[PDB]
Amino acid sequence: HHMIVRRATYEDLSQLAVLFDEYRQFYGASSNLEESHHFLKQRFENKESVFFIHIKDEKITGFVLLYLGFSSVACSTYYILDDVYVTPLFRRQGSAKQLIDTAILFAKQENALRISLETQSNNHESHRLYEKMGFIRDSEFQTFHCFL
Amino acid sequence: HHHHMIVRRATYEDLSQLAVLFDEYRQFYGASSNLEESHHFLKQRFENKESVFFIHIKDEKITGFVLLYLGFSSVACSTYYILDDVYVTPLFRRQGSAKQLIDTAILFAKQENALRISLETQSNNHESHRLYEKMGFIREFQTFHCFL
Ligand SMILES: CC(=O)SCCNC(=O)CCNC(=O)[C@H](O)C(C)(C)COP(=O)(O)OP(=O)(O)OC[C@H]1O[C@@H](n2cnc3c(N)ncnc32)[C@H](O)[C@@H]1OP(=O)(O)O
Ligand SMILES: CC(C)(COP(=O)(O)OP(=O)(O)OC[C@H]1O[C@@H](n2cnc3c(N)ncnc32)[C@H](O)[C@@H]1OP(=O)(O)O)[C@@H](O)C(=O)NCCC(=O)NCCS
Ligand SMILES: [Br-]
Ligand SMILES: [Br-]
Ligand SMILES: [Br-]
Ligand SMILES: [Br-]
Ligand SMILES: [Br-]
Ligand SMILES: [Br-]
Ligand SMILES: [Br-]
Ligand SMILES: [Br-]
Ligand SMILES: [Br-]
Ligand SMILES: [Br-]
Ligand SMILES: [Br-]
Ligand SMILES: [Br-]
Ligand SMILES: [Br-]
Ligand SMILES: [Br-]
Ligand SMILES: [Br-]
Ligand SMILES: [Br-]
Ligand SMILES: [Br-]
Ligand SMILES: [Br-]
Ligand SMILES: [Mg+2]
Ligand SMILES: [Mg+2]
Ligand code: NA
Ligand code: NA
């Protein structure tokens, strides 16, 4: 093969940390490769999180991070799509679509109820991506935060 | 120590009584009552490494509970808590059980150096909105679901 979407491994973390650090910069964080790599390795070692990466000609182009959720009402599990990012050079080539296609197949393999996520209301690009992938906008619930 | 009311972490010994309230909570969200199913799933959540249950006991009766679980913020490279489920049985409502449960959840999250406590509640749940606003919670993001 020449392109692949697959689960991340320890061997990928050094290159993946660069993209994870770029993703943090998109949301306003200052670049800090040491901090980004440390936290990426903490999430990678956690049993309930799943990383898929898209590789094209041995370069990581993007990633998706999911984690297990529990629904008390249904008495079943689901997945939360927490982070999705494709590096600018590789955008608009289907990397995010392929990453989400794999996340959907993975969630079906795990008999998940659904994949849920939250994205900024003003993030035009992400809304179009999610709608293309079969996600439905839902405003039944309201989020609240207690800042500590 | 001598006390008559307490908010404390749940133990295996509390699960049989706690399952009654957990079953009522599931019925609040539309599920059919099934004590066996509710208890089985409550025990599965209790056995998740990052889940934290607090229960409120008044005169040896469990009046209510809160269930929190660990969240990871990739942007901040830090952890936070999600307040997933909150419930007080009707006989004990409007006595401060939920306020006391959330007061303890806040102290617990501060002990763990969490960034915040976040939650989602139904947009039509006017009682919960008043509770969360009283406790210091604040109402930018849109939820999407893929039902697989
Ligand atoms: C819940 C969360 O975690 S939200 C996190 C959202 N992530 C971000 O916004 C990070 C910054 N942005 C990015 O990394 C990227 O632009 C992404 C992830 C949004 C898209 O990655 P890409 O690989 O470029 O997307 P891909 O090429 O697979 O596009 C698939 C669909 O997404 C939509 N889309 C992607 N980019 C755009 C864009 N710039 N404008 C409009 N729609 C877009 C389209 O529907 C597109 O289908 P199409 O090309 O046939 O029209
Ligand atoms: C919401 C709920 C947890 C409140 O529990 P509670 O122990 O009765 O609440 P408290 O007595 O601690 O009340 C604290 C504050 O919440 C608000 N509140 C609680 N019940 C309310 C009601 N029926 N109407 C309006 N405000 C209400 C008020 O701000 C109240 O402060 P006040 O009594 O000084 O005015 C309870 O009604 C419940 O279990 N409801 C069903 C499940 C649910 O909605 N859970 C939350 C979503 S998971
Ligand atoms: Br490879
Ligand atoms: Br992984
Ligand atoms: Br659900
Ligand atoms: Br494609
Ligand atoms: Br897999
Ligand atoms: Br569902
Ligand atoms: Br966003
Ligand atoms: Br006790
Ligand atoms: Br125990
Ligand atoms: Br026991
Ligand atoms: Br109820
Ligand atoms: Br849990
Ligand atoms: Br009493
Ligand atoms: Br007593
Ligand atoms: Br009891
Ligand atoms: Br504790
Ligand atoms: Br925060
Ligand atoms: Br508010
Ligand atoms: Mg949940
Ligand atoms: Mg997160
Ligand atoms: Na660090
Ligand atoms: Na930040």
Residue numbers in the entry:
A (entry chain B): -1 to 146
B (entry chain A): -3 to 135, 138 to 146
Please give the exact wording used by the authors of the publication that reports this structure.
To better understand its structure-function interplay, we determined the structure of Dpa bound to acCoA. Dpa had an overall topology common to GNAT family acetyltransferases. Unlike SpeG acetyltransferases that form higher oligomers, Dpa formed a dimer through a C-terminal β-strand swap. The acidic nature of the channel likely facilitated the access of basic polyamines into the reaction center. The dimensions of the β-swap channel contiguous to the constricted reaction center likely favored the specificity of Dpa for the smaller 1,3-DAP polyamine. The active center of Dpa is very acidic and involves residues Y21, Y25, Y65, Y128, D80, D81, E116. By contrast, in Dpa, Aac(6’)-Iy and PaiA the phosphoadenosine is docked entirely against α-helix α6 due to the divergent sequence of the P-loop, where the first residue in canonic [GxGx(A/G)] motif G is substituted by a large and charged reside. The large R90 sidechain in Dpa pushes the adenosine moiety against the α6 α-helix. In Dpa, like in SSATs, a swapped dimer is formed by the β-strand exchange, while bacterial SpeG-like enzymes adopt large torus-shaped oligomeric structures.
Here we have uncovered a GNAT-family acetyltransferase conserved in A. baumannii that is responsible for the acetylation of 1,3-DAP in A. baumannii in vivo and in vitro and renamed accordingly as Dpa for diamino-propane acetyltransferase. The crystal structure of Dpa reveals topological and functional differences from other bacterial polyamine acetyltransferases, adopting a β-swapped quaternary arrangement similar to that of eukaryotic polyamine acetyltransferases with a central size exclusion channel that sieves through the cellular polyamine pool. The structure of Dpa revealed a dimeric architecture with a conserved acCoA and an acidic polyamine binding site formed at the dimer interface that shares properties with other polyamine acetyltransferases.
